[PDB]
């Protein structure tokens, strides 16, 4: 959709180029451990799992439908990272982006 919206022009203007737009991963990409890498290292501290693949097997059944109890348990470890490791950097980045122009995020 970004690629399609980039190549849109009617008058002598560009509606939404490959600019003025902040990608969803772009909020957390610029960290020494990325948020994706940070949540990859979550099997530590969880009993019965020793690797990311083991965690995926343990949290997802054969149906590929989430197991409610296991995923609810895993959210209790996911949330503190998203509330302490992401939120301040996200706030700073959003404020900086808003300062230097009006952008769609």
């Amino acid at each position: 959709i970004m690629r399609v919206l980039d190549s849109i022009s009617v008058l002598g203007v560009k509606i939404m180029p490959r600019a003025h737009v902040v990608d969803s991963d772009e909020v957390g990409e610029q960290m020494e451990p990325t948020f994706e890498h940070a949540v990859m290292e979550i099997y530590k501290g969880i009993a019965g799992v020793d690797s990311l693949d083991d965690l995926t097997k343990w949290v997802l059944n054969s149906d590929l439908v989430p197991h409610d109890d296991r995923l609810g348990q895993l959210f209790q470890a996911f949330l503190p990272l998203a509330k302490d490791l992401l939120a301040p950097m996200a706030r700073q980045f959003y404020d900086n982006s808003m300062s230097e122009g009006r952008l769609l995020t």
């Binding site: 059944n61 054969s62 149906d63 109890d69 348990q73």
Partner: protein, 143 residues
């Protein structure tokens, strides 16, 4: 040709067409119960019973286990089973419990390492218990 051994003590003591009418590998049918789910459940139920190896002697002769009273062992062991069931259920409290039972069961005894086979208590291990008894008879050469 040699089968390995699992538990050893290391101490050692222009061709006819072969396409056949009717053979095609395709999967159009999904198992209603679910092959993977039933296989996983069968694997879980497949495990053999735990080796309750309490009070059993050793090669030396000492009884194995923890020096605790029989009824205390039974109570703590039922509590451990309840906790294990809670973990298996993945809830704070298991619905099925072995400790909240209304039935009085104060006479329950569970096997522990407190009592020897003869009926005594392993306050001192059987090896030493024989050791002092045997060493009470000594005789050295005269000076």
């Amino acid at each position: 040709k040699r089968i390995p051994r699992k538990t050893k003590g290391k101490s050692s003591g222009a061709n006819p067409a072969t396409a056949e009418p009717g053979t095609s590998n395709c999967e159009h049918y999904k198992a209603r119960p679910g092959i993977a789910s039933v296989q996983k459940a069968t694997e879980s139920a497949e495990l053999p019973m735990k080796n309750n190896d309490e009070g059993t002697p050793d090669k030396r002769g000492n009884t194995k286990g923890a020096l605790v009273n029989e009824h205390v062992e039974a109570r703590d062991e039922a509590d451990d089973a309840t906790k294990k069931q809670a973990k298996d259920t993945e809830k704070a409290k298991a619905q099925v419990t072995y400790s909240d039972t209304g039935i009085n069961n104060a006479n329950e005894l569970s096997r522990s390492g407190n009592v020897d086979n003869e009926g005594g208590s392993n306050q001192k291990p059987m090896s030493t218990r024989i050791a002092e008894a045997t060493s009470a008879i000594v005789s050295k050469h005269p000076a």
